[PDB]
Amino acid sequence: MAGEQKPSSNLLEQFILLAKGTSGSALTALISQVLEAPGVYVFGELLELANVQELAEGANAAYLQLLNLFAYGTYPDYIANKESLPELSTAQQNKLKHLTIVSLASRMKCIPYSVLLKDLEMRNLRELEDLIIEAVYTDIIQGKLDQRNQLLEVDFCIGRDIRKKDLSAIARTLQEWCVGCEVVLSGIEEQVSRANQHKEQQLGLKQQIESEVAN
Amino acid sequence: GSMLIKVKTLTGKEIEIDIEPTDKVERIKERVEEKEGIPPQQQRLIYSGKQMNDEKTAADYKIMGGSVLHLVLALRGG
Amino acid sequence: SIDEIYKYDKKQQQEILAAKPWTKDHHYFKYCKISALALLKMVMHARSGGNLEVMGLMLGKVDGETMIIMDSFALPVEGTETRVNAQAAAYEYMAAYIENAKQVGRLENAIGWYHSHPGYGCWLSGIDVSTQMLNQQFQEPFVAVVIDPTRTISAGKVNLGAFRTYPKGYKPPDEGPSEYQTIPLNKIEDFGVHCKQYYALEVSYFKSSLDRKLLELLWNKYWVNTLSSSSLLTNADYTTGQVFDLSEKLEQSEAQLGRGSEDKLAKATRDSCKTTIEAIHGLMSQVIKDKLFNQINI
Amino acid sequence: VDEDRKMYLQAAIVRIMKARKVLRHNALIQEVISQSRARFNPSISMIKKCIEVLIDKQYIERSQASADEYSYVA
Amino acid sequence: IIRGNQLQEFAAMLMPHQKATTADGSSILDRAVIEHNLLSASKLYNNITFEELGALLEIPAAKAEKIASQMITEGRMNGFIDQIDGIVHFETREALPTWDKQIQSLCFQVNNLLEKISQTAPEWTAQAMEAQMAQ
Amino acid sequence: SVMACGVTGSVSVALHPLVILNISDHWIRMRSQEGRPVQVIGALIGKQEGRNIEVMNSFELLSHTVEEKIIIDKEYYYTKEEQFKQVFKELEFLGWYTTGGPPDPSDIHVHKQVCEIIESPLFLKLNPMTKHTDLPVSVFESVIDIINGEATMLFAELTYTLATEEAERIGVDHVARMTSTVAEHLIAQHSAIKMLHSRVKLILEYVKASEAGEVPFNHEILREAYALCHCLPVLSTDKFKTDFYDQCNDVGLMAYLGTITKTCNTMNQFVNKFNVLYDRQ
Ligand SMILES: [Zn+2]
C-alpha cells in the first residue's frame, strides 16, 4: 500500500488483516507468506498487533525467534541455530544470508569475500558472487565487486530490515557524532573568525603604519 | 542614437534603431538582438552582395536612416 | 526605510536626469547607487559570454549626487573592447523593454550601458575610448562601469568602478581615480593615451530587507554546495596560463629595469603574490572539503 | 532564356542566403518569392531543390531543427 | 541476464534462415545474446578474470578474453585489461567521484527520510519547526 | 482551490540573485503603486538538474486584477520577453512568483497562464506578508493523468537551491554581510550547512522523540543512520591520500614560488634603494 523501501507493498495491511483473521495455523500461513518480504524482515509496528504477539510465543514462537533474527540475528546464527527457527526456503535461507551480508557491508566499506564465504557458509566463488550479484541486483548494494581487496565495493545500501531497537541508542549516537563533527567544524569556524579576521586587522593596521610612514 | 538606421531581415524586416554615425555594427548587432531576440551572428550583415564586417561602424558603409543591415538572420526570434 | 531607496521616484529620478550638474561640474556624480541587476547579468553574462565582448543599455536613475545603475549586464555578442561605439547597438533592448516596463509601473527610462569583456573586464578600450569619450560628450551622464568577470572569478570581490571619464576639455581634478588595468596589446597603448581621463563613482548598493533575508537563506542551503566545489580541477589550466604570463612578466620586468609598465618588477611581484594567493585559496577550500569528509572515520 | 535566368538567379539567391540565412525552407522560398515579384513565376516545389542548390556550394547549410528552417553556412 | 533454455523456447519465435545459424554454433542471436548478456555483466561489474568469467559464462576463458577483444573490436567496450594476469577492469570511480557520490547519496537519503517523517509527522513537522525556530 | 498535484518539466536556466531581489522589487513596486501588499507576478526561471529543481530568477511583471484573479497580461509578457529576449536570451520564462497567503485559485490561474507559453511551467510563491521562517518559495509542476473519468493536469511542489556563480556568490556573501574573502566565501558554506542543519536537526528532534515516546515507531528512522555511519570518511582509500598529497604539494610549491615572488620583489626594491643612496640608480 504505502511506498518507500520495503517488501511487496501488499504486506502491510495484507498481514494486518491476516494476523487479525488468520491465527494459529492460519497465522502460520500468514507467516509463510510473510517470509518472502525482504525489506521488512522485521515487524516492529507490525508485531505491534497482539495477533503477531500471539504469532510470537504462540505456535510460532520459533518464528518470533526468526523475526528477531531479522531484527537482530544473522543467517550464520541459523548456520549454528539450524533447528531453533522455523523452516525456510533455500531462497529464504539465502535471504537470511543477505540479511547478515547487507548488515556486514552496512558495517564495512567493503566486506571480504571470504568473510561471507565462512560466516554465511559460502563455499566457492560461483555461488558466492551469485548471491552477491542478486543482492546488488536487488539494488540494495551500490559500489561494485571489490575483488582486489577481495571485498564488495559499496556506495549505497537500501535499508534491509526494521531491525528491532537500538533505535533510541541508534539515533542518539547519531546525534552525538553529528554534534561532534559539528563542534570540530565550528571550532574551525571561529578559528577562521580569528585568523583572516585577524588578517583583516593585521593588514589594516600594518597599512596604517605604512601610510603614516610618509608624513 | 543619433543615426536612426534600419536592420533588415532576409524577408524584409527593416527595424528602426537609434545609432551613431560612428556606432559600431559590432554593437549594432547587440542592439538588434537586445531588441529582436534574433541573435546577430546569423543576422549576417551583408552590404550589396558583400558582407558588412561585424566589427565596423554602420556609417563605415555610408549607412543612414533608411539603410539596411542584413540578417541572413533567423526566424525563431520574431 | 530599507525600501526608501528602491523607490524609483520617476519624478525625482528624471528630474536629476535633466538636472545637468555635470555641465556645471563633471565631478558632481560621486556616488553610484546600484541595484544588483548590474551584478546579476553583468556577472553571469560576462561569464556566460565566454570571452565575447558585449554592450548595450543599463536601467537606472540619479539620486542627489549619484548615478544609479538599476541594471547592467552582457550580450551574447562580440566586438566590444574594439567596436567603434559598440554599446549603442544593444540599446534596442530597452528601446523596447523600458517602454512597456512603464506598462508595469517600471516608469524608468534608459540610463546607461550594460556590457562585459568576458574573461577580461567590462569597460571601454581604445576604440571604445573613442566610444566612451565621444559618448560622454554625447550622452553625459555617462559612465565606464568597470568590473572584470574572470577577475571577479579568481578575486572574490566586485571591483566596481563607475568611470565618468573626463570629457575633452575637462582634465582629472583632485579626484580622478583612473583605474590603471593590465590591458592586452590591442588597447594598452590607447589606455596610456587615455588612462587619466576618467574618475570613479562612489558605487554603493541599495536593497530591501527581504533581499538580505533571501541571500542568507540562499547560503542556508548553498553551504552543501560549498562543500562540493572541486574547482582546483576547474582552472588549474588557468593557473598554468598565469604560470606562463608571470614568467613573461618577469622577463619584461627584467627588460625594463635593465638600463632604463612602471617598475614591472614590483608590479610583477605583486601580481604573482596575488595569483598564487588565488590558487592557494582554491586549494584551501578543496583541502577543506577533503580533510573534512575524509576525516569522518567510523 | 532558361540558362541566363538560372545564372542571374544563382547569384541573387546566394547573395540573399549570405545576408539572411533563410534560414527556413518554406518561409525562405516565400520570401524569395517576395524579393523577385517582378521577375516571373517560379515553381513552388523545387523550393526544396532551391535550398538544395545552395546547400552544395557551401553557401548555406541544413540545420537540425527542421526539414525546413535550416542555417546559413560560410 | 537470462540463460539458454530459459529462452530456447524463443527458438520457436525464430526464422528458418535465422534458425539456419552460424559457424561457431552460437547462432546469430545467440552471440547477440552474449553481447547483451555480457554487456549486462559489463555495465555492472568491477573486475574479473576469464576462467572466472568463462566458467561464469560456461564457456572457454580463451573465448572469453578472445571475444572480449572482439567485443571491443566493436568499440562498444570500455574498461581495461591485463592479458597476462588475465583480468579486466572495473573503475573505483575512488575519489572526489565517489566522494560526491555518497555525499549527495546521503543528501537524497536524508531528505527522503526527512520528508517521509514530515508527512508522517506534519504535526511533528510543525513541532520540530517550532523547536528549530528556537534553534 | 483547484490544484492538481503533479510532476516535473523542462526548467534548466542560469541564475543571478537580484532577480530574487526583483521578486522583492516587484512586490515593492506594486505595493508602492497600490499602497498595499500586491499579489504580483514574476518571470520565474531556474536550474533543472536530473530530478532536482532550482527556482531562481524571476523579476517584475504585470499582474492585472480580473475581478478577483491575478492575471499575467499574457501578450504584455510576450512584449516584455521580446523586450529582453534580444539580450536576456540566456533565460526562459519558467513560471511566476507572487505575494500573498497560500497558493489560491488566482495563483492557480496565473500558473495556468504560465502554462500557456510552454506546456509544463513552474510555480513560485513568495510573500513578505506571509509569516514563515523558511525562504518563501513554493514551486509547482505538472503531470497529465486520468481520475474519475476526467483527464486533468497535475500541479505539485518540488524543492530548490540557488545559483552557484562565482561573482554572484561573492555578491551574495557581501550583500548578506556588506562589510576577509574566504570568510566571505565560507559563509555561503555556513549558510547552506545551517539550512540543512535545521533540516536534519528537525530530523534529529522528531527522531529522538521516536525512541522517547508518543511519536511514531518506524524502522526506517535511524537505519538510514547506519547507512550514514558506513558512509564515513569516503575514500580511505589511499588513492585520494596520494591524490591530496598531490594537490597540496602542488599548491604549496606554488606558495613556495610565491617565496619567492614576495621576497624577490622585496629584494628588487632593496637593490633599487641600494642603487638609490649607495648608488645613482
Ligand atoms: Zn569603441
Numbering used by the authors:
A (entry chain G): 1 to 215
B (entry chain N): 1, 100 to 176
C (entry chain E): 24 to 283, 296 to 333
D (entry chain O): 672 to 745
E (entry chain D): 272 to 406
F (entry chain F): 29 to 207, 215 to 316
Paper text:
The CRL2 E3 ligase consists of a Cullin 2 (CUL2) scaffold in association with a catalytic RING-box protein (RBX1), with the substrate adaptors Elongin B (ELOB) and C (ELOC) at its N-terminal. When associated with the von Hippel–Lindau (VHL) tumour suppressor substrate receptor, the CRL2 complex is the primary regulator of the Hypoxia Inducible Factor 1-α (HIF-1α) transcription factor. Activation of CRL2, in common with other members of the CRL family, involves a cascade of E1, E2 and E3 enzymes, which conjugate the ubiquitin-like protein NEDD8 (N8) to residue K689 on the CUL2 scaffold. CSN5 is responsible for the deneddylase activity of the CSN.
Using 3D classification, we were able to generate maps of three different structures: (a) a holocomplex map at 8.2 Å, (b) a map of the complex with little or no density for VHL at 8.0 Å, and (c) a map of the complex with little or no density for CSN5/CSN6/VHL at 6.5 Å. The two partial complexes likely arise from compositional heterogeneity in the original samples from which the structural analysis has succeeded in isolating subpopulations. In line with subpopulation observations from our cryo-EM, we identified subcomplexes of the CSN–CRL2~N8 missing the CSN5, VHL, ELOB or ELOC subunits. In our map of the CSN–CRL2~N8, the Cullin arm was observed to shift downwards away from CSN3 in maps deficient of the VHL substrate receptor, consistent with the coupling of VHL binding to a conformational change in the rest of the CRL2 portion of the protein. This type of behaviour may allow the CRL2 to adapt to individual substrates and substrate receptors which vary in size and geometry as has been suggested with the CRL4A system. In addition, it may reflect changes associated with remodelling of the CRL2 by the dissociation of the VHL and the binding of alternative substrate receptors. An interface between CSN1–ELOB can also be seen in the partial structures of CSN–CRL2~N8 missing VHL and CSN5/CSN6.
